[PDB]
Amino acid sequence: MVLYFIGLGLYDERDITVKGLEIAKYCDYVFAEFYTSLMAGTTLGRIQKLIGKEIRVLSREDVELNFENIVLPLAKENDVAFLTPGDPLVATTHAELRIRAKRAGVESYVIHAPSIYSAVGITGLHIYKFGKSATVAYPEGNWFPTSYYDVIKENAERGLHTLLFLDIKAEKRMYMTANEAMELLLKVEDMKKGGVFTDDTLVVVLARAGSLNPTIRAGYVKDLIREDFGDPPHILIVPGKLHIVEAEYLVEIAGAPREILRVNV
Amino acid sequence: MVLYFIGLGLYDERDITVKGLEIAKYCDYVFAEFYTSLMAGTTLGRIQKLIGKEIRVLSREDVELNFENIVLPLAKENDVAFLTPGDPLVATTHAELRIRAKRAGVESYVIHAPSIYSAVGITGLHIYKFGKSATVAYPEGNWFPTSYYDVIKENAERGLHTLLFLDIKAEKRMYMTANEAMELLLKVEDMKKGGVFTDDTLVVVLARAGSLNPTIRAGYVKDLIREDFGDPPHILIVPGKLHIVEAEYLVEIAGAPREILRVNV
Ligand SMILES: Nc1ncnc2c1ncn2[C@@H]1O[C@H](CSCC[C@H](N)C(=O)O)[C@@H](O)[C@H]1O
Numbered sequence: 001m002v003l004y005f006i007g008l009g010l011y012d013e014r015d016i017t018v019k020g021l022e023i024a025k026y027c028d029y030v031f032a033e034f035y036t037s038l039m040a041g042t043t044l045g046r047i048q049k050l051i052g053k054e055i056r057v058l059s060r061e062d063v064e065l066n067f068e069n070i071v072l073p074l075a076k077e078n079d080v081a082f083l084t085p086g087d088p089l090v091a092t093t094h095a096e097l098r099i100r101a102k103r104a105g106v107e108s109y110v111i112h113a114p115s116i117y118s119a120v121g122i123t124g125l126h127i128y129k130f131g132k133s134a135t136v137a138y139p140e141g142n143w144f145p146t147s148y149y150d151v152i153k154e155n156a157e158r159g160l161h162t163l164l165f166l167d168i169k170a171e172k173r174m175y176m177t178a179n180e181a182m183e184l185l186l187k188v189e190d191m192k193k194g195g196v197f198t199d200d201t202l203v204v205v206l207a208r209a210g211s212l213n214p215t216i217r218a219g220y221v222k223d224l225i226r227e228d229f230g231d232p233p234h235i236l237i238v239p240g241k242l243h244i245v246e247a248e249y250l251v252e253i254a255g256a257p258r259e260i261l262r263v264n265v
Numbered sequence: 266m267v268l269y270f271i272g273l274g275l276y277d278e279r280d281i282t283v284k285g286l287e288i289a290k291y292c293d294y295v296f297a298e299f300y301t302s303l304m305a306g307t308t309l310g311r312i313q314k315l316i317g318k319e320i321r322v323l324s325r326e327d328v329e330l331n332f333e334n335i336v337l338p339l340a341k342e343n344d345v346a347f348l349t350p351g352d353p354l355v356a357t358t359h360a361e362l363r364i365r366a367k368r369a370g371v372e373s374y375v376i377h378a379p380s381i382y383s384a385v386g387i388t389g390l391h392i393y394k395f396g397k398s399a400t401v402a403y404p405e406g407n408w409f410p411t412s413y414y415d416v417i418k419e420n421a422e423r424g425l426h427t428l429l430f431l432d433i434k435a436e437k438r439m440y441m442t443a444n445e446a447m448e449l450l451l452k453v454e455d456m457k458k459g460g461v462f463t464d465d466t467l468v469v470v471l472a473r474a475g476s477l478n479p480t481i482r483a484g485y486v487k488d489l490i491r492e493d494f495g496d497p498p499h500i501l502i503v504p505g506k507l508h509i510v511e512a513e514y515l516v517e518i519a520g521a522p523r524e525i526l527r528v529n530v
Contacts (some may be wrong), residue, residue: 019279
């Protein structure tokens with residue numbers, strides 16, 4: 001009688017922690033959601049094979065509206081696991097589900113897994129220098145989200161880097177690319193004209209983190225906006241002022257223009 | 266010809282990912298460093314037994330001064346693994362090691378694992394609201410560093426949370442407790458009087474993240490300063506203004522006082 005929130009990691013079924021896998025194997029029922037992020041290097045079948053259980057996938061509605069009706073009931077007489085991509089409580093609203101588990105008299109435990117939030121360390125940018133994060137959401141109807149632009153502005157003014165989660169429409173299988181994010185940002189710039197995001201802005205793209213060969217690229221928007229970064233998921237980063245060692249890594253590992261080595265102190 | 270940076274995760278020998286374990290077993294030689302952080306929930310012996318490999322531990326000097334003489338030579342003609350606590354490259358000095366590998370004509374790949382940076386999501390605080398991060402360092406001699414206090418001020422001022430890594434003397438295996446961190450912050454406050462950290466400041470303590478029984482506590486400094494949060498490692502967080510959902514999680518999961526539901530939202 002317990003509910004486990006277990007993260008599956010960044011890219012494939014092997015990104016789950018050993019602890020998570022062993023626990024998942026001891027569970028009676030296994031549920032999961034694959035709408036908060038995209039695991040581009042595996043399939044449900046492969047995940048099911050590793051765990052050795054039949055995984056029942058839930059939609060955003062099943063979870064947000066009926067988690068206490070689909071999962072919690074079974075957790076009262078069995079050990080149940082709820083699997084999610086990356087880390088279960090990062091950039092998701094799953095934390096609140098623990099409250100539902102409590103109010104249902106069910107004890108819950110959390111098993112972490114690699115998260116894109118920390119995986120960005122592979123870009124060479126100092127993790128402690130990342131400020132507030134934001135999500136670039138697809139505009140819909142007459143609604144055109146722009147809050148992420150102000151986040152970049154605020155962080156940049158403080159010399160902090162900005163991590164930009166990219167939008168996803170799992171049911172429509174739509175995964176926003178870094179290219180699309182840049183296009184949207186250039187549009188917001190023309191509107192607000194704050195000089196926050198332009199063709200000369202240095203950005204960093206990380207695609208398919210977790211894979212053995214993720215795409216890590218750094219350069220100016222004018223140069224990368226049309227570059228092919230490979231299959232999704234993608235994450236976009238707008239660095240603040242760089243430390244010399246950050247610039248060196250971007251040049252040596254992410255193929256950034258050598259001119260950025262010359263920092264303006 | 267290959268060097269694999271493999272994260273060991275948060276607390277014990279099972280926090281490594283399945284991918285990291287299989288690759289560690291696949292490698293011919295395995296090195297590891299325990300100076301950027303420690304794995305408090307296990308021992309070198311237990312890690313070795315899990316991997317089934319002899320593990321050569323490296324000191325900060327071994328790595329910072331002689332990485333290219335100790336690790337890379339073998340990586341040139343063999344598959345070599347370099348284990349680090351948490352997620353590789355979160356520690357600021359790890360990144361440049363990939364440049365050294367490049368210089369020596371050695372390929373390198375990163376296998377991620379959970380980091381405390383993302384693991385803080387278990388506190389119920391929204392990850393996007395975390396701003397710049399900082400480390401609380403023990404004062405010594407005539408040196409009293411206090412930049413971490415300023416980090417809190419700047420973050421809180423913008424309604425952002427502040428993750429505070431607590432000092433660790435890896436070699437001496439000594440951990441700064443949240444209690445000691447709170448006392449230091451109160452001292453800094455008494456010196457700067459910026460009204461950033463007082464007895465009425467709401468803080469969150471996360472101890473032994475990764476274990477199945479971490480200590481998650483939230484409350485005002487005046488009540489938590491002498492509380493026993495259990496064995497290390499301890500992490501201190503000074504949240505900024507809270508979203509009602511964050512506050513409710515702290516009350517329901519971290520035993521925070523109901524007062525935060527009206528004072529800190
Ligand atoms: N492997 C990966 N590579 C690049 N971006 C990734 C990624 N995994 C997730 N993301 C990014 O983050 C978004 C999902 S947000 C949910 C994140 C998840 N809980 C975690 O811990 O990683 C995606 O739309 C994408 O922009």
